Amino acid sequence: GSSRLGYSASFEQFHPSDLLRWCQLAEQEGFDSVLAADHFHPWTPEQGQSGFVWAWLGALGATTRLRFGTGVTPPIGFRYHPAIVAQAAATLEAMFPGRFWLGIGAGEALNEHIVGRYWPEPAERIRMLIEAIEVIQKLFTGKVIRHEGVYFKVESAKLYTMPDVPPPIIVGTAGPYMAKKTGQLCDGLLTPGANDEKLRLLLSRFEEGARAAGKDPRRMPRMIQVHVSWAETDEQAIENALREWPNGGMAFPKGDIRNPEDFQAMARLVRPEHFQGRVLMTSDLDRHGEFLQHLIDLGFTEIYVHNVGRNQEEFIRAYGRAVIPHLRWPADAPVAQA
Amino acid sequence: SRLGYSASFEQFHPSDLLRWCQLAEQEGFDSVLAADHFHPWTPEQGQSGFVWAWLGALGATTRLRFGTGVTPPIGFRYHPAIVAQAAATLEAMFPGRFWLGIGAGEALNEHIVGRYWPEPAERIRMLIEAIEVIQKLFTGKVIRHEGVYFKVESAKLYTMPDVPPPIIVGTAGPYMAKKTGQLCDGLLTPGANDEKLRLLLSRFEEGARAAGKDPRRMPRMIQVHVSWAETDEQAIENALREWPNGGMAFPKGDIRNPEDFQAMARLVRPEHFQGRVLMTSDLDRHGEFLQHLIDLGFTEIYVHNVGRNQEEFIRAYGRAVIPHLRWPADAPVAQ
Amino acid sequence: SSRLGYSASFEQFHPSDLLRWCQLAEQEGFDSVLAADHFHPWTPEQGQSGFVWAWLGALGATTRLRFGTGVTPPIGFRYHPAIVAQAAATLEAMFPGRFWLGIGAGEALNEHIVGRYWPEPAERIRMLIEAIEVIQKLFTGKVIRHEGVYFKVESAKLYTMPDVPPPIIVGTAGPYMAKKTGQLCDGLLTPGANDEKLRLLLSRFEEGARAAGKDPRRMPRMIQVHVSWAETDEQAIENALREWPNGGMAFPKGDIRNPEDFQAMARLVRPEHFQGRVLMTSDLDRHGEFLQHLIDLGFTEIYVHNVGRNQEEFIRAYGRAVIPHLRWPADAPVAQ
Amino acid sequence: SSRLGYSASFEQFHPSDLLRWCQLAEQEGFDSVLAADHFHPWTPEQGQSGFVWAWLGALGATTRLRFGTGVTPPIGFRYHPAIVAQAAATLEAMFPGRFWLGIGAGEALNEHIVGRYWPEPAERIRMLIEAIEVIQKLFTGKVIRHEGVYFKVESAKLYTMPDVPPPIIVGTAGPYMAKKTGQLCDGLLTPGANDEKLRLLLSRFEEGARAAGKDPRRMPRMIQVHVSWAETDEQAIENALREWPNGGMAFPKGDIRNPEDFQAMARLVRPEHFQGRVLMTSDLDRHGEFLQHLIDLGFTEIYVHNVGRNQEEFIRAYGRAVIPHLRWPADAPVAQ
Amino acid sequence: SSRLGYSASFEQFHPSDLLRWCQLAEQEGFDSVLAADHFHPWTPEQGQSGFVWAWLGALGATTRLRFGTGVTPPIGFRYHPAIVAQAAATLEAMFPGRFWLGIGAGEALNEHIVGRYWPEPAERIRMLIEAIEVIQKLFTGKVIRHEGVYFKVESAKLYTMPDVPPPIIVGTAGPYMAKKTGQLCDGLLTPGANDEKLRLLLSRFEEGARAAGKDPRRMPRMIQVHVSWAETDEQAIENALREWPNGGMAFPKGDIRNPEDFQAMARLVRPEHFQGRVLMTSDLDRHGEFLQHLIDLGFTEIYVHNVGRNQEEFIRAYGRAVIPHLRWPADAPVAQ
Amino acid sequence: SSRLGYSASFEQFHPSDLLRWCQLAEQEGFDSVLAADHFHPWTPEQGQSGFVWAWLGALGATTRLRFGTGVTPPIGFRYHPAIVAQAAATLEAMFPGRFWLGIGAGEALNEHIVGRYWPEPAERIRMLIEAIEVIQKLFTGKVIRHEGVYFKVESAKLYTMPDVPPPIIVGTAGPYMAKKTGQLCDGLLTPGANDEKLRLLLSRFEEGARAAGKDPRRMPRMIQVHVSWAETDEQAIENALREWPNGGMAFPKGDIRNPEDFQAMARLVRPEHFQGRVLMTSDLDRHGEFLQHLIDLGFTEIYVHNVGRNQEEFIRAYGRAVIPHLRWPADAPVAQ
Ligand SMILES: OC[C@H]1O[C@@H](O)[C@H](O)[C@@H](O)[C@@H]1O
Ligand SMILES: OC[C@H]1O[C@@H](O)[C@H](O)[C@@H](O)[C@@H]1O
Ligand code: NA
Ligand code: NA
Ligand code: NA
Ligand code: NA
């Protein structure tokens, strides 16, 4: 199994020009793919950014050979109508064949609240996401389609710019129910870092869903997104997590909180202990290696790593040299693409 | 020495458009106008890439200026806050290069979301409110908005260039042209006869001056359609097959389907292109047509060649047209 | 037995003139009238649009003609279905055996005035099907209630209701709705079209009727056609271009909102565009052959719209040279 | 000059009977007709409700009578204001000088069928005022647009429009709306009431007109009254109880939805309740004095509803013994 | 042993007076209270409408009486069903075994204040049925969610919830809802009516219960009646006319919006109209026989509304001459 | 003269316990009660939420305490403003001089159950200001109507209305709304905060009052504080952590929907987070000095919430060691 790893492009924290440069470097350093946040707002003012991912993805596509995906876009009609997400996905895949994966989810109020609409509870947003998947799949047939359901209405519509093979639809979720639905309805799973018991359960539910739908889950992407803090010292790594990613230490439902200023005030309660299992904080690059290998061993076929510190260039070079070449991937592991 | 290239998303695969824009840069074109469509006018045109993704590729692989021509930020395909963010991100990644072209939209694209489609005069009111939303967001502060058409809860563009991109309104309406001068940074209008073009320029100037602005330093842009080919016969045949909508001198903003335009196209004949699509192999004639528009006082011209011979068109213009155009030395460009 | 339908063009003619011409048409051997339910003309040059429902009362009281709306959209823009039902019941009650309720999916030209979401055709068909349900409930003459996707009717009864309801006729060129018409309603009205399309629509209507246990050979199959008669061919063509350029528009027109829009579109229309759509000739034998062909396909009624302003001359010419020579099947069903 | 108005009670009588009786009323000296715009009767025992707009075409074509709706609610339940405007313009165009558009705030009895929120009277007055704005825009005969609190009208024009619009008459018993009527419209219609209320409404209408620069002495002031004539007083009383118990209900009725509701309420009504509301007598001199009193108050037109089913006998009795003796002011303004 | 229900007329009496009279009624042998949930009185002359939910806390804390709403409409006008559920749960938790939640389809008199579409009775029954579903979900004492035609409830739990929920009692005179009550709820409340109607409602309730596997002989069957006791018959009749004319209105009242509307309607009411509706007599034996008859039909509880302002005198007269003589079945189910 | 307010925590305590403890607080020198209007507790561990409006009736009837909602959101989620007005009027009418209506912008914890759009705080302030207008209209005791951005009220009147309405008190920590409170309402309620914020709010309230022509020195300025008293400091801290972790959440909480959400957030809270928010000490001198400081800033009333379950011990400890030693201004305005 040949050398590789995913890089998480944190739109919440970094200017898109910096992200583009760092992705180009990550490619040179042995990373093979990019996960890009679809935000309108950062979690906190101190993070201080939120570029429009869809424009940036065109730049990335045109200046690298990396695979890339949204992690994740909510196509449930607040910022984005599902038909527009479908078109955007189809266009990226058409321009960069084999390279794009459409990552979708149920959304956060932080981003969606700007349009001033009723914000459903999570279970209802899941129902919206399932209907949005239906819309996207209809459009991905490349024919004239119509749709009318509980949440969305689509008049006669066709994607004329449509690749021969649609990009994969990946659902980002930590919910057991949706993980099973993902296996059933979509092409692969993306989930956050969590303890072994939860990760195993989500994998198991995804597999159950796939198999009951007649699909082989061993050939479907199982992707995980993790957060780490590497720096020259442990002390600096911890301080970076506290300053840059206090939301990482918030082990509670965050999808109803509307403002960066709200998270900013909540952040004041966060302490180093709260990052346990959520942000790996250490200068020891062997420990970073072991953490990632463990996740491969659980059966994840791709790992996207978000380094929370502003030392992105140093992180990328350190991983390229001391982490990525030592990871052992299974020989035939499925990657997000077609 | 310079000229604008129109990237026809209705007709051409976005990969082809990217490659042709790169070529246009080498051949002396200095800027790109990109259609924001969901559907082509006809199936025979056969494309519609998502412009916002493509603009990132263009920005990263050329030094061209570029703009949407145009996006409707009036809440069907696109909520105004998202357009503002997209614009700010393009400007931030490609400083000095992006111009946000906006308009009142066409049912062809907007009908997909299944909502009430207002009459043009009402869509103008929606566009004016959208401009207010975009400008609030472009202050780079936390803003709120509640008007007739749009609600925006506490929202801030954190990724915001020091100087916002210009807002350009695409319109052929005298009323909106005046509002454009008053509220926005420059005008984009289609090819039309001299009397209409002069009226729209005059209204734009009136609007600017009444708002305390100097219109001689604001972009006045025009988008035209031509057909160049090896023979006149081939140029005409290309216009008929590729751009019959160019021969439809009637309001098109309510027509919903490519198949509707397709059936309408069957009535279109060469005479219908008069003043709308210049069809000739004579590149001197193309030169004189463009020069006339400069002389009227347009500071930029975006040229859409309707034929599929884009590479040949670009090289023919680069050699025989662009180097001979005479622009005013200090004409304002969109940026 | 001798007969033909006259199309009253509310788009073009003052209602007083239409009333007078229908009275003349009766004298000249026409036996029925189709009346447009419009709010706007297709073009300003056409220049009229009377409220059909008031005019029909005058027609009913001053002639013995059968008459029908061709067609009313009872789908809740200009008209709520319950009001159409009442209007229909009143006409039938005042003029027993003479009225037929022609309904359809509507045009934006007329419906857009109320400023509402205009559904795509397929959805408007679903609306029409629900409207038929409302009208039929009211036609039972009892207290009814209705709640569906599109319409809500609180406790409602037509107290002024004839013993036998007027027939419901659906005007459509859609194969799907033509079948539904056979199934749910009493007869079909369709525009002039080529033989293959007309045969398909007839076949679908029959299939629908038979599957619902009805005999379609006893149900009206009506067609509405457009012609231009004048003293010369040249004048006939000129009349079509000036008066009815929309006749030369072989494309979906249901989304276009303004007379001024059609007016600008009209500038592209040429004589060739009328082929199969508006017969333009002074030769009344040719008019005869065109109409006879349609009878032969199996239409039981034909409504003729002459596009020229020469209505009185048209009517007299048809009365003398066309109507007496048409050969109808002996037992053809007519709209009640 | 000899004249009187006849009230055509759509609630009670088949439209064919009403048409025949109006033709007789013309022969017997009546000069005008007021026609109820209902969907339902007040009670099942009344038992009818023809669609007035169709019937008015028959009336127009078979008599020389003036006629008007008394009244149509153009406030977007049964009827969108733009459709009422078109209907009015068409009747006036077909029957110049003969139609008057009577409008009001509506009754739930008729409007509830469409299943919408029923505003309080004061709000329905605001809706009526906005509807007047829509109707008047359309009556300019140009392309207009409208957007207000209650109504949206996209680009719309009445192409069939008489040179002079029909008058807009507001039917109301409200002092506020009576003043608005003088200000915004062409004349007033009010029900029978005591002298103090009638004087107040007349006074308010005048105030409204004068403040708008108009001369109210040249504007119609119309009243609609209910009587019971029969061969004996006993029969006249019995007819009022059986046919028009709603006449004896001195309380707000605009929220009551069903004929069955009025039917049950009717059981409480007694002869005393008709005082000042329905004159019940066989004495035709008394009918004469009652009507003359109303002229003397300054009403320029009176529409009489006889509540009994003896319409033909009522008409002949009035024609002979009442109408020829009424003394009108010489140059009183009539609705046109 | 000895007992009877007292009706607390919020429409008529200041809540302080009602509290004092309930405390007296307890001393005089009444064992339970029915409290009207109104926002408005039927007439201005009645002149009150306290917020029942606050008053019930005072009653609960100062007596040992059972008590219930008679009735609250939990159908989302004045009150969202979740709030009714919480209010009910809190009263039962504070006063275990004492509260019964009486619910119904509501009256416009109270619900119209919020300015929403008022459905027809049949639809309001559907709303009531869905509200019962909401209340019962909340009464499980767990986190629940709900989405139906009429109501949406996001994750919600009643944390202050007694171990046993209060019974849900439906107030209705409708045969259909009476059956649904037996099926879905815990007991019935119905107004005074003739024997045939009362027997039908009891029969339907039993049928509903048994089909749902329940034993109706152990479920409350409650009736609410209206009487007028005074020193003389003349005074008793006068009190009924002045205080409770709505009692003499044998017609649907659920659409009438204003006290002033009922006030005007009241003018038609006469003593005869109270037959079977308000027993008007000074003869306390007659009161006794009337109540006993209702027990004999199988009602397990009777709530008595004396319409006169002489509440204290009524209570003492009943306590002495009526209550001790009623004979209840030995094991009759009471609302708890 | 000696006094202090007691905060009745519906989030934590069974309403029967709260009633008993308020009766004890009365005996121990407390003079008033603030009652939370919740549907849900902040955490499951708190574990309660009685319907305050029912409980207030029990309180009123069994004590002589002043009492108020702290606070009710009358902005149309759980509660329509008209119903709040009625509830308030009824309490004041039953318990004259004792009730104060505390209102605010609400929390999603309680309001989200009805499944509606939850506006940002600034918009909810606009809703609250419109609700104040509705409540004040109803408090005139006349028939009123209202139509604004957020609320519609059809003809409505509070028939049960005290001569003098209860005061309207706004609970807010916002400088803008504090000024509006001075302008539009009768007094302010605010949470414990640092001196600079409390001074700003007082200053804004005064500015608002004076600009509206009022004297703010005669209007209530109330503060609600949270403490933890126990036998040891260790126990006091432990009680705060277990019972009131939300007290240690110095961030906006108005968008958080579920008890389980707060429950998870609570896990981050530590003793330091209570600084200035919950005074945690067994030292009753320290409690005394804390409360006295607030009097010295110019608050006329203080409501104290002890977060521990040791309410009876807290009440007795305060009654003995705190309340008698507080020094109030001689003529300080109290909520009435
Ligand atoms: O238009 C902006 C830039 O675009 C380039 O491709 C042109 O060829 C340059 O001369 C110009 O500065
Ligand atoms: O078609 C119905 C009737 O219409 C009349 O005008 C015809 O002349 C008659 O022959 C026929 O009875
Ligand atoms: Na274009
Ligand atoms: Na027509
Ligand atoms: Na009438
Ligand atoms: Na609280």
Query: C-alpha distances in angstroms, F190 versus A102, C16, F42, F174?
Result: 49, 76, 19, 9
Cα F127 from Cα F130, distance rounded (Å): 5
Chains in contact with B, counting 3 or more C-beta pairs less than 8 Å apart as contact: A, C, D, F
The answer to whether B165 and B260 are in contact (CB under 8 A) is no
Residue F334 belongs to some domain of the structure? no
Q: D-chain residues within 8 Å CB-CB of F155?
A: 120
Pocket of ligand 1, candidates B63, B94, B221, B301: which has the most ligand atoms within 8 Å of its Cβ, to mutate?
B63
Cα F336 from Cα F333, distance rounded (Å): 9
Number of Cβ within a 10 Å radius of residue C4: 22
Residue B330 belongs to some domain of the structure? no
Cα C73 from Cα C87, distance rounded (Å): 13
Question: What are the residues whose beta carbons fall under 8 Å from the beta carbon of B49, sequence distance 6 or more?
Answer: A91, A94, A95, A161, B9, B13, B14, B17
Burial annotation B85-113 (CB, 10 A radius, 16+ → b, else e): bbbbbbbbbbeebbbbbbbbbbbbbbbbb
Cα E256 from Cα D130, distance rounded (Å): 26
Tokens representing C191?
């525009």
Q: Please name the residue whose Cα sits nearest to atom 8 of ligand 2.
A: C31
Number of Cβ within a 10 Å radius of residue D312: 14
One-letter amino acid at C29 equals G
The answer to whether C241 and C273 are in contact (CB under 8 A) is no
Collapsed DSSP state (helix, strand, coil) of residue D78: coil
Ligand 4 ion local residues (Cβ < 5 A): C 36
The total of structural domains in chain A comes to: 1
Number of Cβ within a 10 Å radius of residue E235: 16
Cα A171 from Cα A190, distance rounded (Å): 6
Do residue F58 and residue E93 have CB atoms under 8 angstroms apart?
Answer: no
Cα C309 from Cα D194, distance rounded (Å): 56
Q: How far apart are the first and last CA of chain D?
A: 17
Collapsed DSSP state (helix, strand, coil) of residue C157: coil
Tokens representing C213?
């246990």
Q: DSSP code of C165?
A: P
Cα E266 from Cα E213, distance rounded (Å): 45
Q: Which of A115, A36, A17, A69 is nearest to A336 (CA)?
A: A69
Q: Which of B25, B37, B225, B286 is catalytic?
A: B37
Query: C-alpha distances in angstroms, D107 versus A324, B107, D110, E6?
Result: 80, 40, 6, 40
Residue C65 belongs to some domain of the structure? yes
Query: C-alpha distances in angstroms, D92 versus C15, C244, D134, E302?
Result: 11, 27, 18, 65
Q: How far is the CA of D86 from the centre of ligand 4 (A)?
A: 17
Query: What residues of D are in the F interface, CB distance below 8 Å?
Result: 120, 122
Experimental method: X-ray
Q: Which of F125, F126, F130, F168 is nearest to F151 (CA)?
A: F130
Residue of D123, D127, D176, D255 to mutate for F, most F C-beta atoms under 10 A: D123
Tokens representing C51?
């409220």
Measured at the CA of D270, the angle between CA D267 and CA D273, to 5 degrees, comes to 120
The answer to whether A273 and F267 are in contact (CB under 8 A) is no
Tokens representing D111?
């409007």
Query: Do you find a cis peptide bond into E71, omega within 30 degrees of 0?
Result: yes
Count of alpha carbons within 13 Å of F110, Cβ hemisphere only?
28
Q: What is the DSSP string of E94-140?
A: HSTT-EEEEE----HHHHGGG------HHHHHHHHHHHHHHHHHHTT
The dihedral built from the CA positions of residue B78, B80, B83 and B89, taken in this order, carries a sign that is negative
Measured at the CA of A146, the angle between CA A140 and CA A149, to 5 degrees, comes to 100
DSSP lists the bridge partners of residue D69 as D35
The answer to whether B64 and B29 are in contact (CB under 8 A) is yes
Helix locations, chain B, DSSP H? 14-26, 51-61, 80-93, 107-110, 120-137, 174-183, 194-210, 232-242, 258-265, 283-296, 310-320
Cα C50 from Cα C16, distance rounded (Å): 10
Q: Which of F11, F26, F28, F38 is catalytic?
A: F38
Strands C168-171 and C152-156, sheet pairing: unpaired
Q: How far is the CA of F224 from the centre of ligand 6 (A)?
A: 10
- D97: alpha, beta or left? (left if phi > 0; alpha if psi -120 to 50): left
Min CA distance, E92 vs chain C (Å)?
Answer: 39
Q: Please name the residue whose Cα sits nearest to atom 6 of ligand 2.
A: C65
Cα F149 from Cα F75, distance rounded (Å): 12
Beta-sheet strands, E only, within C96-231 = 99-103, 144-147, 152-156, 168-171, 187-191, 221-228
Angle between the N-to-C axes of helices E175-184 and E195-211, in degrees from 0 to 180, rounded to the nearest 10: 30
Cα B65 from Cα E268, distance rounded (Å): 84
Q: What is the DSSP string of E224-263?
A: EEEEE--SSHHHHHHHHHHH-GGGG--S--TT---HHHHH
Q: C183: part of which helix (H) or strand (E)?
A: helix C175-184
Number of Cβ within a 10 Å radius of residue A251: 16
Q: Nearest by CB to C39, which of D15, D86, D259?
A: D86
Q: Please name the residue whose Cα sits nearest to atom 10 of ligand 1.
A: B30
Min CA distance, C92 vs chain D (Å)?
Answer: 11
Give Cα A318 to chain centroid, integer Å: 23
Q: DSSP code of B166?
A: P
Angle between the N-to-C axes of helices F121-138 and F175-184, in degrees from 0 to 180, rounded to the nearest 10: 10
Torsion angle, alpha carbons of A265, A271, A277, A280, to 10: 100
- Residue D60 burial by Cβ neighbours in a 10 Å radius (0-12, 13-18, 19+): buried
Residue of B116, B117, B122 to mutate for D, most D C-beta atoms under 10 A: B122
Ligand 1 proximity of B177 Cβ (cutoff 6 Å): no
The dihedral built from the CA positions of residue C65, C66, C70 and C72, taken in this order, carries a sign that is positive
Would you mind telling me the total number of residues written for chain C in this entry?
A: 336
The answer to whether B228 and B319 are in contact (CB under 8 A) is no
Count of alpha carbons within 13 Å of F205, Cβ hemisphere only?
29
For chain F, give the secondary structure using H, E and C.
CCCCEEEECCCCCCHHHHHHHHHHHHHCCCCEEEECCCCCCCCCCCCCCCCHHHHHHHHHHHCCCEEEECCECCCCCCCCHHHHHHHHHHHHHHCCCCEEEEECCCCHHHHHHHCCCCCCHHHHHHHHHHHHHHHHHHCCCCCEEEECCCCEEEEECCCCCCCCCCCEEEECCCHHHHHHHHHHCCEEEEECCCHHHHHHHHHHHHHHHHHCCCCHHHCCEEEEEEEECCCCHHHHHHHHHHHCHHHHCCCCCCCCCCHHHHHHHHCCCCHHHHCCCEEECCCHHHHHHHHHHHHHHCCCEEEEEECCCCHHHHHHHHHHHCHHHCCCCCCCCCCC
Residue of D126, D255, D262 to mutate for E, most E C-beta atoms under 10 A: D255
Q: Which residue has the tokens 């207290």?
A: C143
Tokens representing F274?
């209570």
Q: DSSP code of A73?
A: B
Cα F104 from Cα E4, distance rounded (Å): 43
Burial annotation C285-322 (CB, 10 A radius, 16+ → b, else e): eebbebbeebbeebbbbbbbbbbbbbbeebbebbbeeb
The answer to whether B104 and B80 are in contact (CB under 8 A) is no
Strands C144-147 and C152-156, sheet pairing: antiparallel
Do residue C122 and residue A146 have CB atoms under 8 angstroms apart?
Answer: yes
Cα D30 from Cα D41, distance rounded (Å): 25
Query: C-alpha distances in angstroms, A306 versus A311, C53, C182, C195, C239?
Result: 11, 72, 65, 68, 75
φ, ψ for residue C304 (rounded to 5)?
A: -105, 125
Residue F333 belongs to some domain of the structure? no
Read off the CATH number of the domain in which C102 is found.
3.20.20.30
Ligand 1 proximity of B23 Cβ (cutoff 6 Å): no
The answer to whether C75 and C151 are in contact (CB under 8 A) is no
Torsion angle, alpha carbons of A112, A116, A118, A122, to 10: 20
Cα E28 from Cα E62, distance rounded (Å): 15
Query: C-alpha distances in angstroms, B131 versus A144, B15, B95?
Result: 33, 31, 21
Number of Cβ within a 10 Å radius of residue E234: 11
Rg (C-alpha) for chain A, rounded Å, is: 19
Cα D293 from Cα D303, distance rounded (Å): 14
Q: What own/partner pairs with CB < 8 Å and gap ≥ 24 does D142-147 have?
A: D145/B119, D145/B121, D147/C115
Q: C-chain residues within 8 Å CB-CB of D147?
A: 115
Q: Nearest by CB to E268, which of D108, D264, D273?
A: D273
Q: Which of F14, B271, A74 is nearest to C268 (CA)?
A: B271
DSSP lists the bridge partners of residue D19 as none
Q: How far apart are the first and last CA of chain F?
A: 17
Does chain E touch chain F (at least 3 C-beta pairs within 8 Å)? yes
Cα F91 from Cα D130, distance rounded (Å): 43
Question: What are the residues whose beta carbons fall under 8 Å from the beta carbon of B66, sequence distance 6 or more?
Answer: B31, B32, B33, B34, B55, B58, B59, B94, B97, B98, B99
Would you mind telling me the total number of residues written for chain A in this entry?
A: 338
Strands B31-34 and B65-68, sheet pairing: parallel
Chains in contact with D, counting 3 or more C-beta pairs less than 8 Å apart as contact: B, C, E, F
Q: How far apart are the first and last CA of chain A?
A: 19
Residue F243 annotated to the active site: no
DSSP lists the bridge partners of residue F227 as F279, F306
The answer to whether C188 and C169 are in contact (CB under 8 A) is yes
Cα D193 from Cα D198, distance rounded (Å): 6
DSSP lists the bridge partners of residue E300 as none
Tokens representing C261?
């829009």
Ligand 2 contacts (CB < 6 A) are C 26, 31-32, 64-66
DSSP lists the bridge partners of residue F301 as F222
Q: D-chain residues within 8 Å CB-CB of B121?
A: 145
- D210: alpha, beta or left? (left if phi > 0; alpha if psi -120 to 50): alpha
Q: Which residue has the tokens 């019964």?
A: E100
Q: Please name the residue whose Cα sits nearest to atom 7 of ligand 2.
A: C31
The answer to whether C14 and C48 are in contact (CB under 8 A) is yes
Cα A246 from Cα E54, distance rounded (Å): 47
Cα E92 from Cα C223, distance rounded (Å): 72
Cα B304 from Cα B286, distance rounded (Å): 12
The answer to whether C232 and C308 are in contact (CB under 8 A) is no
Strands B151-155 and B143-146, sheet pairing: antiparallel
Q: D-chain residues within 8 Å CB-CB of E273?
A: 268
Residue E334 belongs to some domain of the structure? no
φ, ψ for residue E98 (rounded to 5)?
A: -115, -20
Q: Which of F234, F232, F254, F250 is nearest to F242 (CA)?
A: F234
Tell which residues of chain E come right before a gap with C–N over 2.5 A.
none
Beta-sheet strands, E only, within chain D = 5-8, 32-35, 66-69, 99-103, 144-147, 152-156, 168-171, 187-191, 221-228, 278-280, 301-306
Cα B143 from Cα B154, distance rounded (Å): 6
Tokens representing D142?
């140009």
Collapsed DSSP state (helix, strand, coil) of residue E76: coil
Residue B332 belongs to some domain of the structure? no
The answer to whether B60 and A23 are in contact (CB under 8 A) is no
Residue E211 belongs to some domain of the structure? yes
Residue of F69, F159, F256 to mutate for E, most E C-beta atoms under 10 A: F159
Cα E73 from Cα E82, distance rounded (Å): 12
Q: DSSP code of C276?
A: T
Resolution (A): 2.2
Helix locations, B188-325, DSSP H? 194-210, 232-242, 258-265, 283-296, 310-320
Q: Which domain holds residue E221?
A: 5-325
Q: F-chain residues within 8 Å CB-CB of B144?
A: 120, 122
Do residue D268 and residue E269 have CB atoms under 8 angstroms apart?
Answer: yes
The dihedral built from the CA positions of residue F240, F241, F245 and F250, taken in this order, carries a sign that is positive
Q: DSSP code of E167?
A: P
Q: Nearest by CB to E50, which of F16, F41, F160?
A: F160
Min CA distance, F87 vs chain E (Å)?
Answer: 5
Q: Which of E36, E60, E65, E49 is nearest to F93 (CA)?
A: E49
Tokens representing F163?
């001569």
Chains in contact with C, counting 3 or more C-beta pairs less than 8 Å apart as contact: A, B, D, E
Q: Which of E11, E38, E112, E226 is catalytic?
A: E38
Strands D144-147 and D152-156, sheet pairing: antiparallel
Q: C-chain residues within 8 Å CB-CB of B269?
A: 268
Ligand 1 proximity of B30 Cβ (cutoff 6 Å): yes
DSSP lists the bridge partners of residue B5 as B32, B303
Residue B52 belongs to some domain of the structure? yes
Give Cα E185 to chain centroid, integer Å: 15
Min CA distance, C98 vs chain B (Å)?
Answer: 39
DSSP lists the bridge partners of residue A35 as A8, A69
Do residue D58 and residue C55 have CB atoms under 8 angstroms apart?
Answer: no
Query: C-alpha distances in angstroms, E292 versus E295, E325, F20?
Result: 5, 9, 42
Tokens representing E234?
């003349």
Beta-sheet strands, E only, within C185-326 = 187-191, 221-228, 278-280, 301-306
Give Cα E133 to chain centroid, integer Å: 21
Q: How far apart are the first and last CA of chain C?
A: 17
- A107: alpha, beta or left? (left if phi > 0; alpha if psi -120 to 50): left
Q: F-chain residues within 8 Å CB-CB of B154?
A: 120
Q: Which of D286, D328, D284, D321 is nearest to D28 (CA)?
A: D321
Collapsed DSSP state (helix, strand, coil) of residue B144: strand
Give Cα C233 to chain centroid, integer Å: 27
